[PDB]
Design a binder for this molecule. Structure first.
Ligand SMILES: Nc1ncnc2c1ncn2[C@@H]1O[C@H](COP(=O)(O)OP(=O)(O)O)[C@@H](O)[C@H]1O
Ligand SMILES: C[C@@](CCO)(CC(=O)O)OP(=O)(O)O
Length: 313
């Protein structure tokens, strides 16, 4: 028997932005969404996880002990008993350079560690258990561009494009320093909007459009749609009191409308205080070098693959 296993996953960015979860425990998405897994050129932006045999159950985030994760570990106690010789395992996670979408990565890394222990497991089944840790875990488990179909009862994640399809594109992230609204605050309020039912329908409509664009690798059509979805999403949120796009972020966006005339770009805003800007590779350095970032820090990002594990120790 072994003593521990390591694994790694990459953070995610919504493309069809998810708002609302069926239940605070199982965290099933109330509607269909889509996303991409991202990192930087070196793959340095990531979440690393270690699951190991222990006398008692410990959960560690960035070296800090934590009093959701235990639920997943317990459900797969049989896997660990076989691999380690005990059901009692501890979890240790370390995040690096992640902007938004950290929880997705942490959850996916758990899944890839489990699949690494019992490879014949159905990853789509494991994904269901992982949503308790983060509702968008599928994005990071499968990588690339995914669509997660959902009616609020059952959710299923599908790979639509590999990261290689995005070889000609880059994402420049502008990180602002504004305090962010917890994701749970967003899920809680968006359902209160009168426009929510319509939003659930349009979200599904957009996902289908993304799948068609995928047929001919219309990468630009997909990011353009993501900008439109971003605008709808955050209009609904503002209407319920959740304002993600703050002053300097609005300013950056207005700047982007001008630059778009010069060379193509499209932006996405999730729940955090970041503006993600899609752009062609030949223009990435150019965008990355602009001066008036309105106090924001800049990161160069790429689309990457799904969670993976290492040989058991
Ligand atoms: N590596 C990890 N493993 C498990 N849970 C994590 C990990 N990183 C963060 N989390 C949990 O997810 C929460 C943040 O999730 P969320 O609000 O979705 O932020 P983000 O959008 O950046 O993921 C944190 O408060 C933490 O409790
Ligand atoms: C709010 C959102 C996910 C919340 O579960 C929207 C989305 O990306 O689909 O973004 P973020 O919290 O990961 O930043």
């Amino acid at each position: 028997t072994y003593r521990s296993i390591g694994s790694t996953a990459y953070p995610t960015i919504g493309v069809v932005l998810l708002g609302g979860i069926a239940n605070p425990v199982t965290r099933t998405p109330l509607h269909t969404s889509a996303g991409i897994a991202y990192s930087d050129s070196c793959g340095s932006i990531r979440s690393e996880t270690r699951i190991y045999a222990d006398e008692a159950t410990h959960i560690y985030f960035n070296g800090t002990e934590s009093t959701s994760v235990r639920r997943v570990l317990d459900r797969y106690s049989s896997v660990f008993e076989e691999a380690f010789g005990t059901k009692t395992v501890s979890y240790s996670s370390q995040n690096f350079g992640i902007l938004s979408g950290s929880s997705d990565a942490g959850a996916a890394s758990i899944g890839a560690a489990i699949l690494g222990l019992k490879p014949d497991l159905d990853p789509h089944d494991v994904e269901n258990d992982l949503r308790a840790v983060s509702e968008s875990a599928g994005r990071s488990l499968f990588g690339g561009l995914t669509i997660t179909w959902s009616d609020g009862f059952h959710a299923y994640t599908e790979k639509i494009l590999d990261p290689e399809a995005f070889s000609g594109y880059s994402i420049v992230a502008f990180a602002f320093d504004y305090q962010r609204n917890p994701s749970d605050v967003i899920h809680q309020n968006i359902v209160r909007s009168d426009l929510y039912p319509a939003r659930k329908k349009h979200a599904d409509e957009h996902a289908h459009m993304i799948k068609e664009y995928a047929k001919t690798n219309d990468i630009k059509g997909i990011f353009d749609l993501a900008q439109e979805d971003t605008e709808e999403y955050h209009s609904i949120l503002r209407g319920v009191g959740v304002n993600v796009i703050r002053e300097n972020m609005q300013k950056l966006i207005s700047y982007l409308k001008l630059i778009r005339k010069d060379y193509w770009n499209a932006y996405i805003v999730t729940g955090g205080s970041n503006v993600y800007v899609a752009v062609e590779s030949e223009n990435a350095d150019r965008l990355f070098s602009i001066e008036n970032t309105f106090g924001s820090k800049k990161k160069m990002l790429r689309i990457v693959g799904g969670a993976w594990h290492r040989r058991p120790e």
